[PDB]
Design a protein around this ligand. Structure first.
Ligand SMILES: CC(C)N1C(=O)C(NC2CCN(c3ncc(CC(=O)O)cc3Cl)CC2)=C(c2ccccc2)S1(=O)=O
Ligand SMILES: CC(C)N1C(=O)C(NC2CCN(c3ncc(CC(=O)O)cc3Cl)CC2)=C(c2ccccc2)S1(=O)=O
Ligand SMILES: CC(C)N1C(=O)C(NC2CCN(c3ncc(CC(=O)O)cc3Cl)CC2)=C(c2ccccc2)S1(=O)=O
Length: 235
């Protein structure tokens, strides 16, 4: 029941995500290794360097999402600035292993709740990250669903400083429609899976606020973010 346009959109997004992720994995040897003052700073550096790799992946993917380059440069910046943390959280949830209760980045960097704390994050942010990851795991999302949810997230008309919210909302719609059609085909008996997925976008907005509080807390400790992350996250 997918239309040709929908099938093409989905296959292209999944392929784009795969290709962008292959370029991130090539960057793995760069990151400061995971291990004392030196050790504490090394753990923090490791996490922020993984984040830089993630930001570069997100930018690379966004460029390949149909419609994104039709937006003005200022709106591209506004949307990605707000979306970045939320996409990172989706990608974090995607990498969660329930058996070990650990998250795996770049194939072989695996971290528990306590490792997140040792990297310099607050329990007020870590606990909701892991709750969100558990909730996402329950949905059993496939590559198509993750790709579509990310596209939907990017085209959020209500982000601060968006100049053309009407255009953004119009570009979002086909991805919402595609996800509706896809989920109705994949699980024709589970009608509540689709709304539960969209409710995760609601959770992401809350997590963005919790993340902003985390960023503020680092400022008081003056743990300084690298320039890319500072530009996107610091006030
Ligand atoms: C490399 C990836 C991203 N590329 C593509 O994925 C793909 N799309 C598919 C088009 C139809 N397509 C199909 N999809 C689902 C089904 C569903 C079932 O099995 O019934 C059956 C088929 Cl044939 C195969 C390839 C491409 C393409 C589209 C149009 C013209 C030329 C290439 S591309 O190279 O840009
Ligand atoms: C503010 C500084 C301290 N913060 C951070 O430094 C950071 N680092 C992580 C960013 C996401 N992350 C990723 N790494 C690699 C990839 C690429 C792949 O694994 O293929 C994908 C992801 Cl999501 C791990 C490190 C954060 C974070 C952690 C969990 C969820 C969301 C954000 S934070 O914002 O608290
Ligand atoms: C606030 C200012 C300093 N900030 C920034 O300047 C900027 N850089 C932009 C440069 C790369 N990127 C793009 N540029 C051009 C194009 C257009 C084409 O390629 O033809 C398409 C894209 Cl995605 C978007 C973000 C940011 C950014 C970086 C990564 C992720 C999200 C936001 S920020 O908000 O910290």
């Amino acid at each position: 029941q997918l239309t040709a346009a929908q099938e093409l959109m989905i296959q292209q997004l999944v392929a784009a995500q795969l290709q962008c992720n292959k370029r991130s994995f090539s960057d793995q040897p760069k990151v400061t290794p995971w291990p004392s003052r030196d050790a504490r700073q090394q753990r923090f550096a490791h996490f922020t360097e993984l984040a830089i790799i993630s930001v570069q992946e997100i930018v690379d993917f966004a460029k390949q999402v149909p419609g994104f380059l039709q937006l003005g440069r200022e709106d591209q910046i506004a949307l990605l600035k707000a979306s970045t943390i939320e996409i990172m959280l989706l990608e974090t949830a995607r990498r969660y292993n329930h058996e070990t209760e650990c998250i795996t980045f770049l194939k072989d960097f695996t971290y528990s709740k306590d490792d997140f704390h040792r990297a310099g994050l607050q329990v007020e942010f870590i606990n909701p990250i892991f709750e969100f990851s558990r909730a996402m795991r329950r949905l059993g999302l496939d590559d198509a669903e993750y790709a579509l949810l990310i596209a939907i997230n990017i085209f959020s008309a209500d982000r601060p400083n968006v100049q053309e919210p009407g255009r953004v909302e119009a570009l979002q719609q086909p991805y919402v429609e595609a996800l509706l059609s896809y989920t109705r085909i994949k699980r024709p008996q589970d009608q509540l899976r689709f709304p539960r997925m969209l409710m995760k976008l609601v959770s992401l907005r809350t997590l963005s606020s919790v993340h902003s509080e985390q960023v503020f807390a680092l400022r008081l400790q003056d743990k300084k973010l690298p320039p890319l992350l500072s530009e996107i996250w610091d006030v």
